[PDB]
Amino acid sequence: PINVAIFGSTGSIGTNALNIIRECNKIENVFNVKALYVNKSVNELYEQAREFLPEYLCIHDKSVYEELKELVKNIKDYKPIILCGDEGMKEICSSNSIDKIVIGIDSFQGLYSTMYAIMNNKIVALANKESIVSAGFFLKKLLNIHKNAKIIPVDSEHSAIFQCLDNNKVLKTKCLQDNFSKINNINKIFLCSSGGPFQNLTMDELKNVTSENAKKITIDSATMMNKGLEVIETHFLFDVDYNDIEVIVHKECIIHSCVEFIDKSVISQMYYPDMQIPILYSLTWPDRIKTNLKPLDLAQVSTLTFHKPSLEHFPCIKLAYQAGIKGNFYPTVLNASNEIANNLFLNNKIKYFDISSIISQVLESFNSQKVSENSEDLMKQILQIHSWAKDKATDIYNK
Amino acid sequence: PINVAIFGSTGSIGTNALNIIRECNKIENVFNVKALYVNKSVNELYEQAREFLPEYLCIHDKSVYEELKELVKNIKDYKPIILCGDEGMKEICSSNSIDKIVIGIDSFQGLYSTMYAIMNNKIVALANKESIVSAGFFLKKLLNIHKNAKIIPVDSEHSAIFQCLDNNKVLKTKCLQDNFSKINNINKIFLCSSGGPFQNLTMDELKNVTSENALKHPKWKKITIDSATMMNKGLEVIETHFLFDVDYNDIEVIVHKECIIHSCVEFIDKSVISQMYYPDMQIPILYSLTWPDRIKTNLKPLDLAQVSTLTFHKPSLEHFPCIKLAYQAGIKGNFYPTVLNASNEIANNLFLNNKIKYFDISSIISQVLESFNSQKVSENSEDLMKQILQIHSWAKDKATDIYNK
Ligand SMILES: NC(=O)C1=CN([C@@H]2O[C@H](COP(=O)(O)OP(=O)(O)OC[C@H]3O[C@@H](n4cnc5c(N)ncnc54)[C@H](OP(=O)(O)O)[C@@H]3O)[C@@H](O)[C@H]2O)C=CC1
Ligand SMILES: NC(=O)C1=CN([C@@H]2O[C@H](COP(=O)(O)OP(=O)(O)OC[C@H]3O[C@@H](n4cnc5c(N)ncnc54)[C@H](OP(=O)(O)O)[C@@H]3O)[C@@H](O)[C@H]2O)C=CC1
Ligand SMILES: [Mn+2]
Ligand SMILES: [Mn+2]
Structure with missing residues (x-):
């Protein structure tokens, strides 16, 4: 079995991760959920623990800690190790029986978690943006020191790029390593964007737009700052020069990004807009496994469009x-x-x-x-x- | 160096191969053209021999041998081995200084040459359709006996499928092997098609169409009709089945009129990977020769924003x-x-x-x-x-x- 820890299990990424693990486990027992970790959402964590029965449970806030140890007594045939705070996060990272850690924690605890996962030589399924945006250079240093540690990206666009690569080449290096793009024969990247709700607006119209027309994430999609941050993440993850990263607006969100290789051949990854595939790939890489997901019907999709953002x-x-x-x-x-x-x-x-x-x-x-x-x-x-x-x-x- | 032979060097595939080879060599001397083989195009073969200076020259039609021999004499300090017919083809195939063979011969000599290339444990960059359509079962058997022989498909759609695969998996197997699609986690294939000149016609117009309608179309004689009826794509379905051990159940023809997405592979997780470029046979040929690697070209980069729209429909x-x-x-x-x-x-x-x-x-x-x-x-x-x-x-x-x- 693949032994997985989910950091930020109650958020968007964590929930989708558990959704896709559950789905795959019905086909064949491929994953053991070994650990779940959250900040404050004690009752939601409790319900997840009941379904997945992980060996470890951890909650960042000590106030709800004891409030978690007695709730768990209601679950039959379940005697987990219940932990708390940074100290518990580190204990999970250290466990020999965990192979991969999904980091779906927002903000800087995401970065802190990522650092300790790497220092413990784990495979890190990274969704947190702050990690690379703020400590890209230092994560590179840690990955250099910790030879078996890996970052595998989970964001749809970055996962798309990663899936377009040849694993024969990827296995010779790893994400965030110098020379990554040379080893993988990458020439440039097309970073696809939905474009957000303001794409058709004129300059004068934009001059007067308000927040109602477009919480935190939606505004970053409107301004396309979200895509700007992804550009920076792309640069670090794949060692691609900024001049070789092109943002492309693809409003249908079927093509999730594209890689142009040095021969000019372009490979791209496609699916319905769904975070399940990228998360699963982070956990199965370098393999794929069966899912029950609806197959992409390209004829039904009919039309794919692309333009340059102004x-x-x-x-x-x-x-x-x-x-x-x-x-x-x-x-x-x-x-x-x-x-x-x-x-x-x-x-x-x-x-x-x-x-x-x-x-x-x-x-x-x-x-x-x-x-x-x-x-x-x-x-x-x-x-x-x-x-x-x-x-x-x-x-x-x-x- | 990659040592290559070009079979049918004067045709469309053959000249595309030499063109990309020449262009790549300008960047970095990667390829050595060791052999060139044609039917009877002696003037064109001479022109190629002058530039590429292959060790071997072969003409299928023995009757133009003296004409070729005399032309070759004009080339200073050049004394290639000049061969004829099947004997010559087999001789080139058995040469140990040739590692890869582009098979761009039309009709059945393409198949015969493919058999002999495989029998000599060569990498076969295969464009010829008759080979797999007429002898797929038999080529499978030959590939099991000759362990180091490989077929690598050169047609644009088949090459696209092949490029969509994870070479860490491809290396565990090879084209035409049983269980190729299981080892590569392939679930389904989207075989892309231009759709042919008749794609938009109603059922009623199709009861009525004539060959002039097909020939009139600006975007596209024999080839044009096979495109109109989509029989070309039918043949490529049969080819797909053998190349990738994908069951007929699992091959879907899809019409993509822009010809930018060259085909797609749906994997067992439902993720889909596609290969994209301008319609240009140079990439598929190059990849067959550089596989499992890629090399630098100076080809025009795909401008997705300029292409602007990509479309798909199911053919009835x-x-x-x-x-x-x-x-x-x-x-x-x-x-x-x-x-x-x-x-x-x-x-x-x-x-x-x-x-x-x-x-x-x-x-x-x-x-x-x-x-x-x-x-x-x-x-x-x-x-x-x-x-x-x-x-x-x-x-x-x-x-x-x-x-x-
Ligand atoms: N949502 C998406 O599809 C994508 C998101 N991202 C990135 O992923 C990261 C998180 O995304 P998302 O899941 O949407 O965010 P959510 O707000 O939905 O979830 C955050 C999760 O992290 C937990 N958490 C917060 N602080 C701590 C902490 N101190 N210790 C332990 N757990 C903590 C939360 O626990 P609790 O429930 O207790 O609050 C919650 O489970 C962000 O950095 C974001 O930019 C990137 C690509 C796609
Ligand atoms: N053209 C394309 O874009 C594509 C072609 N193909 C396949 O490739 C094959 C040929 O392709 P294409 O290049 O278009 O065809 P062409 O007619 O353009 O070229 C045929 C070549 O084969 C040579 N030839 C014919 N008979 C013999 C023989 N008996 N011995 C040695 N050489 C011979 C010809 O030599 P000579 O000049 O002396 O007559 C010529 O060089 C076909 O089977 C086709 O299905 C597949 C995908 C794309
Ligand atoms: Mn994203
Ligand atoms: Mn074709």
Whole structure:
């Protein structure tokens, strides 16, 4: 059996992961769910524990900890190891009987978890964006030291790229390693985007749009900042130059991304918009297994369309390329300032273009810092810059 | 270096192969063209020999040998081995300085050459349709005996399927092996088709169409009609079945008029992988020679935003019965696909010169198939070739008879 831990099991990624594991396990017993970990959602964790009966349970908040140990007594024939906090997260990461860890934790605990999974030589099915956006350079260092550790991407677009690769080549290297694109003969990447709800809008129309027309995630789809962050993630994951990453708007969301190889042949991965396939592939790689999913009916789909995004209309994309090319903690600053700008737009306090304007001014003010060479100092360093960047964005608004 | 022979070097496949080879060599000297083989195109062969300077030259038609020999004399410091006919073909196949052979010969000499390449443990970059359509079963047997021989498909759709596969799995097996599709986790194949010039016509227009309508179409003589009826795609279904050990149950023809997605593979998890490029035979040929690797080219990059729209529809088996007939013929096996192809050759020509109706094409083919009696399969290459030509000739005659009917 493949022994899997699910970090952030009650969220969107965690829930889809459990959905697809359940489905596959009905066909043949392929997965053992060995561990589940959440922040505060004790009752939802409880119901998952009842179905999946994992050897380990962990909850980040100590207040609901004992509130979890006695709930579990209601489950018959079930005597799990119940753990709490960072210390419990680390105990799960250390377990010899766990092979793969799905990281579906939002924010910086996602990054912290990713670091300890790698340090324990695990396969990490990564969904968390902060991990690579903020510590791409340091994850590369950890992966260099921890030879058997791997990051396998779970986001639909990144999984698509990963699936288009030849595993004969992938097995010679791994994600986030220097020379990855050379070993895999990659020339460029087409990063597909739904385009969000603003694609048809004019500049003058955009000048006056409000949040009602388009919570956090939806606004990032509207501005296409989400795609900008994915560009940065692509660069790290696959060692592809920024100049060789092209964002493409494919509104039907059937083609999930494409890889052009050095001979100019293009390979792409297709399915209905569903997060189950990418998650399953992260857990089965380098193999595939049977599912019961509805087969793609291309004739039924009928029409697939592609256009270039206008950078004037979506300058958040421009800023993400700028921040990636600049490197250092500029992507951390990009993400933090976006968080503030996002919220201000949601509360009708700024206009659409003020979002990119604020982000642009925070980036302009940042200076490159020397990178911390250990996990704990880096976490502090990243949270410091994140906070600074959030503070600066707020300052610019108030001024 | 990759040491290559080009069989049928003066035809479309052969000249595409030399073109991509030349272009790739400019970037990095990767290929050595060791042998060139044609039927009778002596001037064109001489022109190629001047540039590529292969160790071997072969002409099938022994009668133009002196003409070739005298032309070759013009090339300073060049003394190739100049050979003739089957003896020459077999000699090239057995040469140890040739690792890969592009087979771009049309009709049955393509099959004969394919057998001998396999018998000599070569990598065969195969474009010729007759090979698999007429001797798929037998090629399978040869590939089991000659362990280091491989077929790698060169036609655009078959190459696309092949490129969609995970080479970590492909390396565990090879094309035409039993269990190829199980080892590669293949669930279903989307075999893409341009759709032919008749794709948009109603049932009523199809009862009425004539060959001029097909020939008039801007996007596309024999080849054009086979595209119109979709019999070309029917043959490619039979090829697909053998190349990838995919059961007929699991091959779906889909019409994609833009010709950008070249085919797709649905895997057992339902994830779908497709290969995409401009219609250009250079990529499929190159891949057959560089597999399992890829090398740099200077080909025009695919501009997806410029292409803008990609479309798909299901072809109606009522509108294109030739597809239905190809499946039945493949399912039956034996020499039925030889019969399908041969009877089609006549019915095609009949429709071309306005002698029969569109729907008569399939009617004739179906009838020759019904008439055919399963034959005992020859156990060696020579007897089998004789057998195949005999059955081919029979089926052509039978088709002429049902025309008269
Ligand atoms: N949703 C999607 O389809 C995709 C999401 N992403 C990325 O994946 C990450 C998470 O996505 P998503 O699942 O949507 O987010 P959700 O908010 O839906 O889920 C977050 C999960 O993480 C848990 N969590 C939060 N903090 C902690 C912590 N301190 N310790 C342990 N667990 C914690 C939550 O637990 P609790 O229930 O207790 O709050 C919850 O289970 C994000 O970084 C996002 O950008 C990327 C690609 C696709
Ligand atoms: N053209 C294409 O885009 C594709 C073609 N194919 C397949 O490839 C095969 C041929 O392709 P294509 O290049 O188009 O055909 P062509 O007519 O363009 O080329 C045929 C070549 O074969 C040579 N030839 C014919 N008979 C013999 C023989 N007895 N011995 C040695 N050489 C011979 C010809 O030489 P000479 O010049 O002297 O007559 C010529 O070089 C066909 O079976 C077809 O199904 C498959 C996919 C795509
Ligand atoms: Mn995404
Ligand atoms: Mn074809």
